[PDB]
Design an enzyme around this catalytic site. Structure first.
Site, short mmCIF file in Angstrom:
data_model
loop_
_atom_site.label_atom_id
_atom_site.label_comp_id
_atom_site.label_asym_id
_atom_site.label_seq_id
_atom_site.Cartn_x
_atom_site.Cartn_y
_atom_site.Cartn_z
N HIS A 40 7.76 -12.60 0.93
CA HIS A 40 7.24 -11.75 2.03
C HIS A 40 6.15 -12.47 2.83
CE1 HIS A 40 3.82 -10.19 -0.70
NE2 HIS A 40 3.23 -10.07 0.46
N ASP A 84 10.62 -11.69 -5.16
CA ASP A 84 9.65 -12.08 -4.09
C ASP A 84 9.10 -13.50 -4.37
OD1 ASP A 84 7.92 -11.84 -1.90
OD2 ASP A 84 6.55 -10.64 -2.95
N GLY A 175 -3.87 -11.02 1.39
CA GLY A 175 -4.54 -12.34 1.68
C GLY A 175 -4.40 -13.21 0.45
N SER A 177 -1.93 -12.61 -1.55
CA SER A 177 -0.43 -12.57 -1.63
C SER A 177 0.16 -13.99 -1.65
CB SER A 177 0.15 -11.84 -0.41
OG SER A 177 -0.83 -10.90 0.06
N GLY A 178 1.12 -14.30 -2.48
CA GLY A 178 1.71 -15.68 -2.51
C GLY A 178 1.01 -16.63 -3.47
C1 LIG Z 1 1.37 -11.33 6.30
C2 LIG Z 1 2.14 -10.65 5.12
C3 LIG Z 1 2.04 -11.58 3.94
C4 LIG Z 1 1.53 -9.23 4.81
O1 LIG Z 1 1.34 -9.00 3.40
C5 LIG Z 1 0.51 -7.99 2.91
C6 LIG Z 1 -0.02 -7.00 3.76
C7 LIG Z 1 -0.83 -6.01 3.26
C8 LIG Z 1 -1.14 -5.97 1.90
C9 LIG Z 1 -0.63 -6.94 1.02
C10 LIG Z 1 -0.95 -6.90 -0.35
N1 LIG Z 1 -1.79 -6.04 -0.91
C11 LIG Z 1 -1.68 -6.37 -2.18
C12 LIG Z 1 -2.37 -5.79 -3.24
C13 LIG Z 1 -2.14 -6.26 -4.55
C14 LIG Z 1 -2.85 -5.67 -5.61
N2 LIG Z 1 -3.23 -4.41 -5.54
N3 LIG Z 1 -3.15 -6.42 -6.65
C15 LIG Z 1 -1.21 -7.33 -4.76
CL1 LIG Z 1 -0.80 -7.96 -6.39
C16 LIG Z 1 -0.55 -7.88 -3.65
C17 LIG Z 1 -0.82 -7.37 -2.39
N4 LIG Z 1 -0.37 -7.68 -1.22
C18 LIG Z 1 0.21 -7.96 1.54
O2 LIG Z 1 0.74 -8.94 0.69
#
Ligand SMILES: CC(C)COc1cccc(-c2nc3cc(C(N)=[NH2+])c(Cl)cc3[nH]2)c1[O-]
Ligand SMILES: [Ca+2]
Ligand SMILES: [Cl-]
Length: 223
Positions: A40, A84, A175, A177-178
């Site tokens: 993603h 993912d 942020g 993420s990845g």
């Molecule tokens: C630009 C694209 C990568 C947008 O991706 C995202 C947009 C908004 C939120 C997330 C995100 N929130 C997240 C919260 C968590 C968590 N609660 N530990 C995790 Cl593991 C991954 C997430 N990823 C996210 O990965």
């Protein structure tokens, strides 16, 4: 990272920042020409930034390399986020040293209770947006599958695992993420999704990398 600490410059040498004019996702260096991140986080125009600590200041040790191709897993489901994972091939190989180094892929999956290190330049607030300049770290344990499925009933597949604190307060967030979830020196997870950040009983969900090692190796070998 919410509730984590400043890692210290270059103490996480396999951490990379995916950049398109701003930092949007993290990733992990697995060899000098390949990075693993989440599907993603895919977009075109990605510049991989290695050896970073402050992402808004060139302090030295940085290597900025363009991605030559990104390979999203063929069975990636954007609605469930199952599979993912994405591999990014770099246009030129990176120079590895003590500040830029790759992390090993696992030979076995990790057990519940394993303590891991999650890092990234993601949001530091659970209620609001505050993005840091330097790399943040968080030590978090892998939770049992029963606690994970109880928190997210019907949404956890066998390619996901939960890690974190059910009391809330400490977690990965947008942020991050990845980026990497490293346990005992092996890359076991990729920051994938969660409900909000650091909320009580809503731990982070990570892509289970031990289920993709043959796919990663076969895909790198043929590209
Ligand atoms: C630009 C694209 C990568 C947008 O991706 C995202 C947009 C908004 C939120 C997330 C995100 N929130 C997240 C919260 C968590 C968590 N609660 N530990 C995790 Cl593991 C991954 C997430 N990823 C996210 O990965
Ligand atoms: Ca920098
Ligand atoms: Cl279930």
């Amino acid at each position: 990272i919410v509730g984590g600490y400043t890692c210290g410059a270059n103490t996480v040498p396999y951490q990379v920042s995916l950049n398109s004019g701003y930092h949007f996702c993290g990733g992990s260096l697995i060899n000098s020409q390949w990075v693993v991140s989440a599907a993603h986080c895919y977009k075109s125009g990605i510049q991989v930034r290695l050896g970073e600590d402050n992402i808004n200041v060139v302090e030295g040790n940085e290597q900025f390399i363009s991605a030559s191709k990104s390979i999203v897993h063929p069975s990636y489901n954007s609605n469930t986020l199952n599979n993912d994972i994405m591999l990014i091939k770099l246009k030129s190989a990176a120079s590895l040293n003590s500040r830029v180094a790759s992390i090993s892929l696992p030979t076995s999956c990790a057990s519940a209770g394993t303590q891991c290190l999650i890092s990234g330049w993601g949001n530091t607030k659970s209620s609001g947006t505050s993005y840091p300049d330097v790399l943040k770290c968080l030590k978090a344990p892998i939770l049992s599958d029963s606690s994970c499925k109880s928190a997210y009933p019907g949404q956890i597949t066998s390619n996901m695992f939960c890690a974190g604190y059910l009391e809330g307060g400490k977690d990965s967030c947008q942020g991050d993420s990845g980026g990497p979830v490293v346990c005992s020196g092996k890359l076991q997870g990729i920051v994938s999704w969660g409900s909000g950040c650091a909320q009580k009983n809503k731990p982070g969900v990570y892509t289970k990398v031990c289920n993709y090692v043959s796919w990663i190796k076969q895909t790198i070998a043929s590209n």
